[PDB]
Symmetry: C4
Subunit: 197 residues, 4 copies
């Protein structure tokens, strides 16, 4: 059968200069494998194609510490694989980056309703290896609160049409709504605690 990567390492994927297919326009928050997950899509740089890369995510926001101190712009770490090595990417085709929301996540108590008033910026940083030269580069993007879609899911972009594993970039930025619990992960766990008889 057709394989994505040949024995010698050659990738069998069938994919303008304006770098707009690097990161998806929006991020989404919906269920995946039983967990509410923050997701965004990464593709590649049109003028500097990469195969390998490392990705990191920071949550930027203003906040008042319990001590009463106002932090104009604080950065909070958003785990996107440092605890598995999943942050070391293999860019054979687009990838849906996942941030599983839990008690360690800054988004632990982010619910659909709190989204209305919340104000933040999810910054994504990808430092990849340009295949052609071998040197390193970096691409960044950002998702403000209005660019994070609760209850949405990314359309798939990979298929097989005649021995060719194809990537449909016309669906790169496309998302669709799905029935998703409005509760924050903290609330879900709070409800789990109160569910015990």
């Amino acid at each position: 059968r057709q394989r994505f990567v040949d024995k010698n390492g050659r990738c069998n994927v069938q994919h303008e200069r304006a770098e707009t297919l690097m990161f998806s326009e929006h991020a989404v928050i919906s269920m995946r494998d039983g967990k509410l997950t923050l997701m965004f899509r990464v593709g590649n740089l049109r003028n500097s194609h990469m195969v390998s890369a490392q990705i990191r995510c920071k949550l930027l926001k203003s906040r008042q510490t319990p001590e009463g101190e106002f932090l104009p712009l604080d950065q909070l770490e958003l785990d996107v694989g440092f605890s598995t090595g999943a942050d070391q990417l293999f860019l054979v085709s687009p990838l849906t980056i996942c941030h599983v929301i839990d008690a360690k996540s800054p988004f632990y108590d982010l619910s659909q309703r709190s989204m209305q008033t919340e104000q933040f910026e999810v910054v994504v940083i990808l430092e990849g290896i340009v295949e052609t030269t071998g040197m390193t580069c970096q691409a960044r993007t950002s998702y403000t609160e209005d660019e994070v879609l609760w209850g949405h899911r990314f359309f798939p972009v990979i298929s097989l049409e005649e021995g060719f594993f194809k990537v449909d970039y016309s669906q790169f930025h496309a998302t669709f709504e799905v029935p998703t619990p409005p509760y924050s992960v903290k609330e879900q766990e709070e409800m789990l605690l109160m569910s015990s008889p």
Copy 2:
């Protein structure tokens, strides 16, 4: 006695251009140190010899999430040393890379029989330091389900014949069958649970 590495760092190993001795042709699944382990062999690049390198492994496959979503090509992390630093290689001679299958592994429930119908691709990525220039490079390979041999074991390639630690590459790709439990690790643990009186 003869040493593999001199005090000054010189390696004492006695080893065409077609890069075919970089990764073993097949991967195997058999017992090592009491654990069912996924293994494959890494050697080196004939046109760009490396001494240092980092290795990572991704499991590529199609799957349907519990939510009913079909993921055409999902990548699952296969731990090959990130939790020990064992993924930072010292390429003095061929190395048998080990993925110890456990509850954290995507192969946790992979048994000999399920292999027949299963469909996947184990992609290996090695980014090493070319000794001659000092610059970095990358080599990749892949193992589809039909290239993963259950119950097989790699032949040893290192020996000492007259003060020379020799590498026999004619046995680089060679494997042999050994009595191996057909059960998946999950099943083994399931059987351990039911064994308690």
Copy 3:
């Protein structure tokens, strides 16, 4: 609303050659998010602007081991993010680096009073990516015991004045005193233990 980072990765921050705005002149020890934290500020290099960087911290001091051995200069690790990935910085504007003091920290039993007699040197090492060339560099600094201010807090340097997220470097090195517990973290935990009825 105004965003810190555009969709294409461009940062929207409004900032002599003498490199003096790279690290704050002093470090401080005060409460943040309910934890006594060692903090210092990092900005950037005026002659080689960086956006990405990794930071590490070492505690240098003389000490006598329980075995009676005197170590003229021993280096102790000061966790500044290796256990979260928070040590991989996004230098969009100044950042207050935090070392949360706990049982794993060399400063676990450092109190305001012990500061008087204590003798040490907190060395900070930042290896960043110069935006202009793409190559790597390193900057270092040090904080002796007399440059660590107990009970002090850094003044904020970020604001928004007419669609511009501004950085006021005139306050880069500025700190102010705040009511802070004089106890070491070990002592705080010792007092917590004795508080149990």
Copy 4:
């Protein structure tokens, strides 16, 4: 008072071409901070001075797995800081690298007596940043069983003679014998278990 590192990052340390002061000639196994520790000293490269560097250690040896398989040359990971970040070195002067022997260490059951018959090779790999160019390099060394000294301790090499933090390399390779328990760490823990009344 005199400081090791100036505020601007300049190190205040007062230190032929043959690279022989990079790694100590021998490694030692003795008590430090209540733990039996494997130690060796690292200094620097005379022809390519480094300030920053990462260090890793591999245990090379032949062994027979519980399955009866003979591994001619197996590599076992020797933790030298990957679980703290202590492996990311600051080479301001010589450093005594420490491997704290515990249940996770390949040397867990290595005792003074077993040393007589044991056969192995502790390979050390240091990849550092040459201060002058900014490019990366690597240095390696090895310690066979006969080069690992049980019950020995390294002489200190740092001192202060007239505002100068001096490094005496004439003592770089020097070690001295100290009363050290002959037991392996496993044995020590075995004795701790049997000590419970």
